[PDB]
């Protein structure tokens, strides 16, 4: 357990739970000065919620997958800073795992994730059977499979580009996890901001002043200038 | 060009302990205002406390800004743009990732309301008006530094 995970760098508490002590009993607000007393009622702060960020979402995803383990369910700010310091190593581990999976399964099985219209069996044994029965080798079958891929699916698959190398954790991350990067839906609805790109401004709307009268016509209307 | 350093919204890194320190300063300012209303402290004691507690908080964020960049995000674009000596100093980065601190009215005195938000978070309407005090000084002091 401890004293070995700490040596090897495996996930472990910063403070050993066995070598841990409580902080005894402190002042009870009856033996304390007025300026050091806890308020009777909790005070609204506007800082009472923890700020959302990328680190929290990625740490929660990695704790779900078991790559790292945290002290509790929600990563702390210390853990968030540590992840920000060491975040490239875990992404490299995920990328290497994806490369190993590609090498093991084969191109047909690996890239069929982004070709949903392909219903044939994509295992290496099935590919070899198809080659023996039809004479179409693995490359021909691969070209045939990519002929059913859509442009949306192809653009999603570009995260596997050897030059892009998108994080596999981010590629498979779901919308509910992604929204927590910025904290979810804004309380003020965006529909108030949205305007059509071809919209023509209605100058008789509720947000406009009354139509500006012609100055000469306004003077003549009030009977100030004769014809 | 090959590295192509850039600047995003999440690259502007506030230190992890700002929310802890802002809440602490808010709790002490709430307690003193109640006891000032009770008549347990006088006006100068309240005026000094708000100025100095928020100046100490603002200056502590600036000190910890660099070790936070050096230990947790050494290749952060904001850090590299200033730590290398290229463009920008620690004071201007503090205006972006820490807090703008305290301003001053034209007749020397400091305003008894801190700007506890940085430019990434977005100044409130009250804070933006207060920050215009220093904007006016810079343009006016330019017209006398040259002449």
């Amino acid at each position: 357990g401890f004293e070995l995970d700490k040596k090897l760098g495996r996930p472990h508490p910063f403070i050993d739970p066995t070598k841990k002590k409580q902080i005894e009993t402190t002042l009870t607000s009856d033996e304390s000065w007025w300026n050091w007393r806890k308020p009777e009622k909790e005070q609204w702060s506007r800082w009472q919620r923890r700020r959302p960020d990328v680190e929290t979402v990625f740490l929660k995803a990695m704790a779900e997958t078991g790559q790292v383990k945290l002290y509790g369910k929600e990563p702390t700010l210390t853990e968030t800073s540590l992840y920000r310091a060491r975040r490239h190593l875990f992404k490299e581990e995920r990328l290497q795992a994806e490369r190993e999976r590609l090498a093991k399964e084969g191109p047909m099985a690996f890239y069929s994730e982004w070709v949903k219209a392909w219903k044939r069996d994509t295992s290496r044994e099935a590919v070899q059977k198809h080659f023996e029965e039809t004479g179409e080798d693995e490359n021909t079958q691969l070209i045939e499979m990519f002929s059913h891929q859509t442009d949306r699916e192809y653009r999603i698959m570009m995260g596997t580009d050897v030059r892009i190398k998108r994080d596999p954790l981010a590629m498979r991350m779901k919308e509910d996890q992604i929204k927590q990067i910025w904290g979810g839906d804004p309380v003020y609805p965006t529909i108030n901001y949205i305007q059509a790109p071809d919209a023509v401004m209605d100058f008789r709307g509720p947000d406009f002043h009354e139509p500006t009268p012609n100055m000469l016509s306004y003077l003549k209307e009030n009977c100030k200038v004769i014809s | 060009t090959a590295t192509s350093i850039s600047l995003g919204i999440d690259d502007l890194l506030t230190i992890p302990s700002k929310g802890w320190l802002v809440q602490d300063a808010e709790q002490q300012s709430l307690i003193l205002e109640k006891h000032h209303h009770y008549g347990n402290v006088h006006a100068v004691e309240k005026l000094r406390q708000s100025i100095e507690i928020w100046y100490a908080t603002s200056e502590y964020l600036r000190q910890e800004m660099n070790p936070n960049f050096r230990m947790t995000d050494p290749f952060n674009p904001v850090h590299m743009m200033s730590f290398s000596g290229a463009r920008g100093n620690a004071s201007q980065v503090h205006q972006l990732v820490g807090m703008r601190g305290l301003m001053s009215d034209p007749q020397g005195q400091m305003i008894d309301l801190p700007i506890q938000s940085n430019l990434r978070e977005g100044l409130s309407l009250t804070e933006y008006i207060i920050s215009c005090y220093g904007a006016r000084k810079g343009v006016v002091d330019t017209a006398v530094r040259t002449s």
Partner: peptide, 29 residues
């Protein structure tokens, strides 16, 4: 200056290079 700083900023070292405690090519010229 930024280009030179990035060029001469060396390897990631220590815990920023390996996830675990460790218990590179050689070029002629």
């Amino acid at each position: 200056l930024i280009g030179l700083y990035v060029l001469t900023s060396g390897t990631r070292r220590g815990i920023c290079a390996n996830r675990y405690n460790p218990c590179e090519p050689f070029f002629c010229n």
